[PDB]
Amino acid sequence: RSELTIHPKEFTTFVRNFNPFLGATNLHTTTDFIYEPLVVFNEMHGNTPVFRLAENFQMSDDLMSVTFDIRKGVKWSDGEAFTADDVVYSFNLVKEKPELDQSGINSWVTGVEKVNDYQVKFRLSEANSNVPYEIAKVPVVPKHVWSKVKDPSTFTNENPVGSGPFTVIDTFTPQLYIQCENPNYWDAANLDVDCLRVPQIANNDQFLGKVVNGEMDWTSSFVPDIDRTYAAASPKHHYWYPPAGTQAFVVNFKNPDAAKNEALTNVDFRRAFSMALDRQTIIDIAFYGGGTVNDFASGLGYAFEAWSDEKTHDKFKAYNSYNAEGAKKLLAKAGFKDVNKDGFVDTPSGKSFELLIQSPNGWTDFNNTVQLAVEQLAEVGIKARARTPDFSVYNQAMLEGTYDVAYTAYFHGADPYTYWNSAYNSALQSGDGMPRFAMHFYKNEKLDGLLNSFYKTADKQEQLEIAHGIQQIIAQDQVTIPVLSGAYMYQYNTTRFTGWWNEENPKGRPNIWAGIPERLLHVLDLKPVK
Ligand SMILES: CC(=O)N[C@@H]1[C@@H](O)[C@H](O[C@@H]2O[C@H](CO)[C@@H](O)[C@H](O)[C@H]2NC(C)=O)[C@@H](CO)O[C@H]1O
Ligand SMILES: [Ca+2]
Ligand SMILES: [Mg+2]
């Protein structure tokens, strides 16, 4: 039988949790593989909808509602019928327990109402032509099971009944689990892989010893010096790194320390921090060349230059280029002056400070980026120190607002809104299920206003106008310190499977991570070799 070895997420121990709503604590093979989406939007190919459990959808002229047609004939793994009842339940379950809202769907969807057993109506809070894409982010679970659960917020869901390709838990240990074919998969005819095989891997250099040895099939991890280390080991060791999203230093505007708050909330300081960075050095050393300098103050990218008001970009490009002497003289003009003879600048109010910059434990490319930056900042007089907390701790720090500076990447969408909304909408700053991305706690009502209006109408210019509005607010306020535009790291082995997505066959985002819904479409193209 065919076993496909994947690695979507680092773990030190496998805890049996297949609750699709508990993304900070669950296993990362639950979404897509156990709970198939209504639609998969192909973000690499202009958000083209690929219909799965939903047949079709249509907005109204109002842009105030949308109806999804559920596909008939679909079965859960326990034989029960997949219906609009299940879709309508799940959107209620998120609606009444918003700690399960991980994308901010509650903000968009006023309520979920059902026409027939295969038609669901969504009533909107605001005009949004992109709301089918938001809707698809939400997990759909069997109401036939989840209804008499007393607390879905803490349900570990260890014995899952799903709609997706791999719902059977064949094996489970703390260091390995095997996830096998749903006996009743609606698309079973299209599926040629038997099982997902998921080994426990704690960090990048434990990973490195496995993948160089050919033990993996499908991965998306950072691999140091990949050409001499991984490529050279076998002719069947392959990779393809299509361009991905923004990576940036995020500063905490609500830091509880008087001294650090004084520095981090100062735009001259954020700018001097940014000019101290050598972006192109970080790319070549920390990532071995795998990226592109991002000198947009707005974080826009390079990939979305068509979207760019290049009058906004030019006015602040200097504050996002390597200029160590510029950094020093900006610190001096601002009044960040070393008054205690340590060589490190102090706040205007006279207090000494050091910036603690965090990146997740085991994310060695990020870890090296931060330590590089620590050195770069020391040269211009800013004292910082690198920290590498466990991802859960790194994550909690940001949601709670206890961190100083954090290095993070963002997801890369079909347009600039996936980055800008996730990184800057202040609505996404409260809520226990919220991701870390907007957690700098900078708030600007007018920024949120443009963001939510990005899809209020259907003409290209007005949208593009609204983009230039957003780019302008962000860049002049230097809210974050953008560094580079990264790569969708992706490695695949043709030893045991064929049909892989690659540069010759670029069917979509190729990664195995949770939050890349195209990974369902990807596994459906895979079949064994001999
Ligand atoms: C947008 C986002 O937050 N993506 C996360 C990924 O970065 C992350 O993958 C990890 O990325 C690190 C930084 O480049 C790598 O060093 C690390 O090897 C890699 N880990 C894996 C398992 O691929 C994944 C998984 O942690 O989470 C994404 O949400
Ligand atoms: Ca197929
Ligand atoms: Mg000093």
Residue numbers in the entry: 1 to 530
List sentences from the manuscript.
VhCBP is a periplasmic chitooligosaccharide-binding protein mainly responsible for translocation of the chitooligosaccharide (GlcNAc)2 across the double membranes of marine bacteria. The chitooligosaccharide-specific SBP is localized to the periplasmic compartment of the bacterial cell wall and serves as a mobile component of the (GlcNAc)2-specific ABC transporter. SBPs share a common structural feature comprising two domains connected by a flexible hinge region. VcCBP and VhCBP belong to cluster C/subcluster IV (C-IV), members of which are specific for oligosaccharides, including mannooligosaccharides, cellooligosaccharides, and chitooligosaccharides.
The N409A mutation eliminated the hydrogen bond with the reducing-end GlcNAc, but simultaneously, two water molecules fit into the corresponding position. One water molecule interacts with O3 of the reducing-end GlcNAc, whereas the other bridges the N-acetyl carbonyl group and Nη of Arg436. A hydrogen bond of Asn409 with O3 of the GlcNAc at site 2 is eliminated by the N409A mutation; however, two water molecules were introduced into the VhCBP–(GlcNAc)2 interface. This may be the cause of the decreased enthalpic term and increased entropic term listed in Table 3. Finally, the N409A mutation resulted in a small decrease in the binding affinity.
